[PDB]
Design an enzyme around this catalytic site. Structure first.
Site, PDB file in Angstrom:
ATOM      1  N   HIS B  14       0.724  -1.126  -0.050  1.00  0.00           N
ATOM      2  CA  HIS B  14      -0.043  -0.071  -0.090  1.00  0.00           C
ATOM      3  C   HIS B  14       0.913   1.168   0.024  1.00  0.00           C
ATOM      4  O   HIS B  14       1.952   1.287   0.943  1.00  0.00           O
ATOM      5  CB  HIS B  14      -0.982  -0.174   1.158  1.00  0.00           C
ATOM      6  CG  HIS B  14      -1.993   1.048   1.366  1.00  0.00           C
ATOM      7  ND1 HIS B  14      -1.473   2.240   1.537  1.00  0.00           N
ATOM      8  CD2 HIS B  14      -3.152   1.050   1.201  1.00  0.00           C
ATOM      9  CE1 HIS B  14      -2.532   3.035   1.750  1.00  0.00           C
ATOM     10  NE2 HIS B  14      -3.654   2.265   1.302  1.00  0.00           N
ATOM     11  N   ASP B  16       1.094   4.103   1.306  1.00  0.00           N
ATOM     12  CA  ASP B  16       1.332   4.889   2.696  1.00  0.00           C
ATOM     13  C   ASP B  16       2.447   3.922   3.317  1.00  0.00           C
ATOM     14  O   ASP B  16       3.346   4.354   3.880  1.00  0.00           O
ATOM     15  CB  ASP B  16       0.097   5.109   3.276  1.00  0.00           C
ATOM     16  CG  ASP B  16      -0.767   6.308   3.124  1.00  0.00           C
ATOM     17  OD1 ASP B  16      -0.175   7.216   2.466  1.00  0.00           O
ATOM     18  OD2 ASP B  16      -2.277   6.232   3.011  1.00  0.00           O
ATOM     19  N   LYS B  17       1.930   2.524   3.200  1.00  0.00           N
ATOM     20  CA  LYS B  17       2.666   1.955   4.060  1.00  0.00           C
ATOM     21  C   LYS B  17       4.153   1.627   3.396  1.00  0.00           C
ATOM     22  O   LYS B  17       5.315   1.375   4.089  1.00  0.00           O
ATOM     23  CB  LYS B  17       2.095   0.479   4.124  1.00  0.00           C
ATOM     24  CG  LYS B  17       2.103  -0.068   5.816  1.00  0.00           C
ATOM     25  CD  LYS B  17       1.183   0.950   6.544  1.00  0.00           C
ATOM     26  CE  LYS B  17       1.516   0.846   8.101  1.00  0.00           C
ATOM     27  NZ  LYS B  17       2.688   1.362   8.754  1.00  0.00           N
ATOM     28  N   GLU B  42      10.965  11.503   6.067  1.00  0.00           N
ATOM     29  CA  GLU B  42       9.626  11.333   5.438  1.00  0.00           C
ATOM     30  C   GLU B  42       9.682  10.949   4.027  1.00  0.00           C
ATOM     31  O   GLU B  42      10.672  11.382   3.237  1.00  0.00           O
ATOM     32  CB  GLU B  42       8.721  12.396   5.768  1.00  0.00           C
ATOM     33  CG  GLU B  42       8.142  12.536   7.237  1.00  0.00           C
ATOM     34  CD  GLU B  42       7.314  13.618   7.555  1.00  0.00           C
ATOM     35  OE1 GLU B  42       7.447  14.748   7.169  1.00  0.00           O
ATOM     36  OE2 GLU B  42       6.336  13.417   8.312  1.00  0.00           O
ATOM     37  N   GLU B  55      15.011  16.097   7.936  1.00  0.00           N
ATOM     38  CA  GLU B  55      16.382  16.388   8.445  1.00  0.00           C
ATOM     39  C   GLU B  55      17.032  15.300   9.339  1.00  0.00           C
ATOM     40  O   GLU B  55      16.324  14.585   9.822  1.00  0.00           O
ATOM     41  CB  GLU B  55      16.253  17.480   9.718  1.00  0.00           C
ATOM     42  CG  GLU B  55      15.609  18.710   9.237  1.00  0.00           C
ATOM     43  CD  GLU B  55      15.685  19.921  10.167  1.00  0.00           C
ATOM     44  OE1 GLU B  55      15.845  19.631  11.342  1.00  0.00           O
ATOM     45  OE2 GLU B  55      15.667  21.094   9.850  1.00  0.00           O
ATOM     46  N   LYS B 158      -5.593  -4.968   1.412  1.00  0.00           N
ATOM     47  CA  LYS B 158      -6.061  -4.461   2.860  1.00  0.00           C
ATOM     48  C   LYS B 158      -6.762  -5.927   3.288  1.00  0.00           C
ATOM     49  O   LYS B 158      -7.132  -6.595   2.637  1.00  0.00           O
ATOM     50  CB  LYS B 158      -6.981  -3.509   2.804  1.00  0.00           C
ATOM     51  CG  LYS B 158      -8.306  -3.356   2.154  1.00  0.00           C
ATOM     52  CD  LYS B 158      -9.084  -2.170   1.989  1.00  0.00           C
ATOM     53  CE  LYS B 158     -10.534  -2.612   1.469  1.00  0.00           C
ATOM     54  NZ  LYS B 158     -11.302  -1.461   1.396  1.00  0.00           N
ATOM     55  N   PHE B 227      -7.884  -6.710  -9.345  1.00  0.00           N
ATOM     56  CA  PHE B 227      -6.716  -5.559  -8.684  1.00  0.00           C
ATOM     57  C   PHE B 227      -5.318  -6.114  -9.032  1.00  0.00           C
ATOM     58  O   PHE B 227      -4.686  -6.854  -8.565  1.00  0.00           O
ATOM     59  CB  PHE B 227      -7.064  -5.896  -7.221  1.00  0.00           C
ATOM     60  CG  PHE B 227      -6.142  -5.062  -6.282  1.00  0.00           C
ATOM     61  CD1 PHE B 227      -5.310  -3.996  -6.618  1.00  0.00           C
ATOM     62  CD2 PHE B 227      -6.855  -5.098  -4.881  1.00  0.00           C
ATOM     63  CE1 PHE B 227      -4.569  -3.327  -5.715  1.00  0.00           C
ATOM     64  CE2 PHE B 227      -5.754  -4.386  -4.222  1.00  0.00           C
ATOM     65  CZ  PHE B 227      -4.851  -3.307  -4.409  1.00  0.00           C
ATOM     66  N   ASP B 235      -1.564   6.886  -7.701  1.00  0.00           N
ATOM     67  CA  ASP B 235      -2.114   7.067  -6.113  1.00  0.00           C
ATOM     68  C   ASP B 235      -1.067   7.943  -5.527  1.00  0.00           C
ATOM     69  O   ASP B 235      -0.175   8.550  -6.361  1.00  0.00           O
ATOM     70  CB  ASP B 235      -2.541   5.581  -5.635  1.00  0.00           C
ATOM     71  CG  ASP B 235      -3.300   5.803  -4.458  1.00  0.00           C
ATOM     72  OD1 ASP B 235      -3.379   6.826  -3.808  1.00  0.00           O
ATOM     73  OD2 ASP B 235      -3.843   4.549  -4.158  1.00  0.00           O
ATOM     74  N   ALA B 236      -1.034   7.866  -4.457  1.00  0.00           N
ATOM     75  CA  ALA B 236       0.064   8.697  -3.564  1.00  0.00           C
ATOM     76  C   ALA B 236       0.211   8.175  -2.368  1.00  0.00           C
ATOM     77  O   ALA B 236      -1.000   7.913  -1.726  1.00  0.00           O
ATOM     78  CB  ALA B 236      -0.275  10.153  -3.588  1.00  0.00           C
ATOM     79  N   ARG B 241       0.478   8.310   7.787  1.00  0.00           N
ATOM     80  CA  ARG B 241      -0.729   8.378   7.210  1.00  0.00           C
ATOM     81  C   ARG B 241      -1.473   7.211   7.740  1.00  0.00           C
ATOM     82  O   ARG B 241      -2.906   7.086   7.361  1.00  0.00           O
ATOM     83  CB  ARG B 241      -0.823   8.665   5.771  1.00  0.00           C
ATOM     84  CG  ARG B 241      -2.159   9.101   5.520  1.00  0.00           C
ATOM     85  CD  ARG B 241      -2.201   9.715   4.085  1.00  0.00           C
ATOM     86  NE  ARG B 241      -3.452  10.053   3.146  1.00  0.00           N
ATOM     87  CZ  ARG B 241      -3.552   9.566   1.931  1.00  0.00           C
ATOM     88  NH1 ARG B 241      -2.898   8.676   1.492  1.00  0.00           N
ATOM     89  NH2 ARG B 241      -4.668  10.322   1.343  1.00  0.00           N
ATOM     90  N   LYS B 242      -1.275   6.351   8.310  1.00  0.00           N
ATOM     91  CA  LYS B 242      -1.693   4.970   8.810  1.00  0.00           C
ATOM     92  C   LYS B 242      -1.537   4.912  10.282  1.00  0.00           C
ATOM     93  O   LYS B 242      -1.206   3.684  10.708  1.00  0.00           O
ATOM     94  CB  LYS B 242      -1.498   3.716   8.128  1.00  0.00           C
ATOM     95  CG  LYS B 242      -1.847   3.908   6.735  1.00  0.00           C
ATOM     96  CD  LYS B 242      -3.519   3.687   6.533  1.00  0.00           C
ATOM     97  CE  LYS B 242      -3.734   3.910   4.808  1.00  0.00           C
ATOM     98  NZ  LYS B 242      -5.321   4.231   4.978  1.00  0.00           N
ATOM     99  N   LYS B 262      11.416   8.401  12.472  1.00  0.00           N
ATOM    100  CA  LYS B 262      11.921   8.761  13.529  1.00  0.00           C
ATOM    101  C   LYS B 262      12.940   8.136  14.399  1.00  0.00           C
ATOM    102  O   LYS B 262      12.242   7.223  14.753  1.00  0.00           O
ATOM    103  CB  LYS B 262      10.597   9.422  14.249  1.00  0.00           C
ATOM    104  CG  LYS B 262       9.555  10.320  13.660  1.00  0.00           C
ATOM    105  CD  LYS B 262       8.633  10.894  14.580  1.00  0.00           C
ATOM    106  CE  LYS B 262       7.419  11.422  13.707  1.00  0.00           C
ATOM    107  NZ  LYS B 262       6.297  11.884  14.768  1.00  0.00           N
ATOM    108  N   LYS B 266      12.652  10.550  19.613  1.00  0.00           N
ATOM    109  CA  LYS B 266      11.687  11.288  19.522  1.00  0.00           C
ATOM    110  C   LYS B 266      10.488  10.587  20.292  1.00  0.00           C
ATOM    111  O   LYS B 266      10.172   9.459  19.946  1.00  0.00           O
ATOM    112  CB  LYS B 266      11.200  11.454  17.926  1.00  0.00           C
ATOM    113  CG  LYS B 266      12.093  12.196  17.298  1.00  0.00           C
ATOM    114  CD  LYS B 266      12.272  12.230  15.934  1.00  0.00           C
ATOM    115  CE  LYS B 266      13.279  13.278  15.447  1.00  0.00           C
ATOM    116  NZ  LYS B 266      14.620  13.552  15.773  1.00  0.00           N
ATOM    117  N   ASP B 268       7.202  10.566  20.416  1.00  0.00           N
ATOM    118  CA  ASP B 268       5.989   9.899  19.625  1.00  0.00           C
ATOM    119  C   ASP B 268       6.516   8.603  19.643  1.00  0.00           C
ATOM    120  O   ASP B 268       5.491   7.883  19.673  1.00  0.00           O
ATOM    121  CB  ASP B 268       6.150  10.741  18.397  1.00  0.00           C
ATOM    122  CG  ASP B 268       5.348  12.065  18.218  1.00  0.00           C
ATOM    123  OD1 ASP B 268       4.583  12.461  18.998  1.00  0.00           O
ATOM    124  OD2 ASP B 268       5.397  12.615  16.963  1.00  0.00           O
TER     125      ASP B 268
HETATM  126 MG    MG Z   1       3.778  14.384  19.187  1.00  0.00          MG
END
Ligand code: MG
Ligand code: CL
Ligand code: CL
Ligand code: MG
Ligand code: MG
Ligand code: MG
Lengths: 377, 378
Positions: B14, B16-17, B42, B55, B158, B227, B235-236, B241-242, B262, B266, B268
């Site tokens: 996919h 995004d993945k 990213e 960065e 999916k 498919f 697509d993009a 995003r997931k 990351k 980080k 997150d």
């Molecule tokens: Mg955060």
């Protein structure tokens, strides 16, 4: 005794939010000409480029590139210096476009959606998200009305609130921390930025009863912020689903909203369960409420509707569910008619695409209009 | 009195993945050479294009373009007919290198935020059954594609699972699998009947416990039809995003922060990993049937503003006593998380493996945050 919660928002010039807005501007334009339009429009942006793609079925005659440039320009992307020149950047249009009983319209996909409401604010939304989103909306307002003409479109807002749990109800005690990082022009010092954000953005938005001598303010903590948006970055539609919903509260069905016509249960399902949850709390039947709907692919009637009042219900949850089913129609074609969702134009959906889909005092957000639910005697 | 819950996963192809995986491959490469690397990488993809940006502060000498192409090729993007030709597609490397230029106890959170960790006794993984099954169906599709048990598979797709539950005094008790949906990319010659039979035989049967399946369970197997092309084509995708698939499939509150690309300085990422370890340790130690653990960080401060636990009334001891145990057994300072969970180790696909099929509930020893501590009540 107490716990913290935090929610964040990004401003209309953040690249992901830009994408959401462009996608919903294209939806608005199709629906204005053809209310039966089928739209699945995504937007991607990066340095000096905006691309729109996806599938549309419409009778509408739309100039997609023109919608893109006019949307970007209106947000404030007027030059490379701001981070995108709406009139000179590359715009790629890769949309696959074609020509073409509401009770019988099936869910187009399998999925579920949650709607949340809480008596802690008059918006019946979590205070963390109310404040984060209203801070961002106020940033945009004071830029455009020239109270703070030095502002630029990008930025972020974040609020941490201290809460008590009162038998399941969430009771805000105080704002712990406010963070704002805003894009600005070269002509203002950090001192002036911080002073203006306190006077013109924070003071009008945050109720005084929540601010005290110990509230922490982080105003541009990462330094100077002159360029923004797409520049040196990227964005896509449907990348800010926590900001779009409840700022982190509640379970999440995962579906993104912008660029989708309301035949898509990701959107219509989410809107109807917010309306149901909000109505339960507004009607005094609970202090806090989550409502879930689950759809089966190709089936109009939901698999299930479920309510949880976090033990705050005035009557049992099963008895609230009887009232919800009496007053709300979860069949997707019926949601679209009942919530007047097939109307676009005059920014109807573009308005939803920054600063949250929920909690808005705007009659176009028909899912914010409560029904008064009274148990049968 | 039952309810339904649904979780979804997307396959490694996919778009995004794919971005998540490329971002974490770059992280792996940097950390292998320089464990002190700072990485905020990213990835964006669209037709015939992969772009990496962000960065990085590193002493590593990395061939970023080679990492991108190797990652995409290994996923299965081996030709334009699959949806991306990893060998000759456009690759743009727009990373900003900062040149290299402190006690771990004193490393502050790099921004303000919070993170939730969840665990539930309903599976041996101590994860929600919806998400275990959705992610294990996706991992199994990748496994059978690559070992040519089902050579007709292609990388995109999916998986989705809807489960019926009862609430047993706040514990989540799965009753049965209601619906399984699989949408997979495939080659130009395999038939729909072969796709349905092989998905049942080689993917569903080995993954889903028979006790949850019955004659009424619904299977939707490529419901939307043919498919053959997927991934970036028409697509993009972007990294981060997931975030629901990466965490708990919709269960619990969400702090909003994405993981891939990351470094572990980080919060997150480190914050989310330590609260998974804490929640998992509460449930594995029998202190609760179900637990969410929240950590909140202040920008620039190593100690969290707060740590909080909620057992949904399933605790064997009071929540406040579980919180004391969590604070005695887990160090929430970000620099100390990184050392204690060995997070600065990269290379050998360590983070790339986190980037599809969920960061949690995995039996791979690289997922150091899945290791249980015995929490003895006092
Ligand atoms: Mg955060
Ligand atoms: Cl056009
Ligand atoms: Cl190239
Ligand atoms: Mg959906
Ligand atoms: Mg009577
Ligand atoms: Mg070749």
């Amino acid at each position: 005794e107490t716990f913290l919660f935090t929610s964040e928002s990004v401003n209309e010039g953040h690249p992901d939010k830009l994408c959401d807005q462009v996608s919903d501007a294209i939806l608005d334009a199709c629906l204005q000409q053809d209310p039966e339009s089928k739209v699945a429009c995504e937007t991607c942006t990066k340095t000096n480029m905006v691309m729109v793609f996806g599938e549309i079925t419409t009778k509408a005659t739309v100039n997609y590139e023109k919608i893109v440039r006019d949307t970007c320009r209106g947000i404030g992307f007027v030059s490379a210096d701001v981070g995108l020149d709406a009139d000179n950047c590359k715009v790629l249009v890769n949309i696959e476009q074609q020509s073409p009983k509401p009770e019988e319209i099936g869910a187009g996909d399998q999925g579920h959606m949650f709607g949340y409401a809480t008596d802690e604010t008059p918006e019946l939304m979590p205070l963390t998200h109310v404040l984060a989103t209203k801070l961002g909306a106020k940033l945009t307002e004071v830029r455009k009305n020239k109270t703070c003409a030095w502002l630029r479109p990008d930025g972020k807002t974040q609020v941490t609130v201290e809460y008590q749990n009162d038998n399941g109800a969430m009771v805000p005690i105080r704002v712990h921390t406010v963070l704002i990082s805003t894009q600005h022009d070269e002509t203002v010092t950090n001192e002036k930025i911080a002073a203006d954000l306190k006077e013109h953005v924070i003071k009008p938005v945050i109720p005084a009863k929540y601010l005290d001598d110990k509230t922490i303010f982080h105003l541009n903590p990462s330094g100077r912020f002159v360029i923004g948006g797409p520049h040196g970055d990227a964005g896509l539609t449907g990348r800010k689903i926590i900001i779009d919903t409840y700022g982190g509260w509640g379970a999440h069905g995962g579906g993104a909203f912008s660029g989708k016509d309301p035949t898509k249960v990701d959107r219509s399902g989410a809107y109807i369960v917010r309306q149901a949850a909000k109505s339960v709390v507004a009607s005094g039947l609970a202090r806090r409420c989550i409502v879930q709907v689950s759809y089966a692919i190709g089936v109009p009637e939901p698999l299930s509707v479920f309510v949880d009042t976090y033990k705050t219900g005035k009557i049992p949850d099963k008895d609230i569910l009887v009232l919800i089913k009496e007053h709300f129609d979860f069949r997707p074609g019926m949601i679209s008619n009942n919530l007047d969702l097939k109307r676009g134009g005059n920014f109807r959906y573009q308005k939803t695409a920054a600063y949250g889909h929920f909690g808005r005092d705007d009659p176009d957000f028909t899912w914010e209009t409560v029904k008064i639910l009274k148990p049968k005697a």
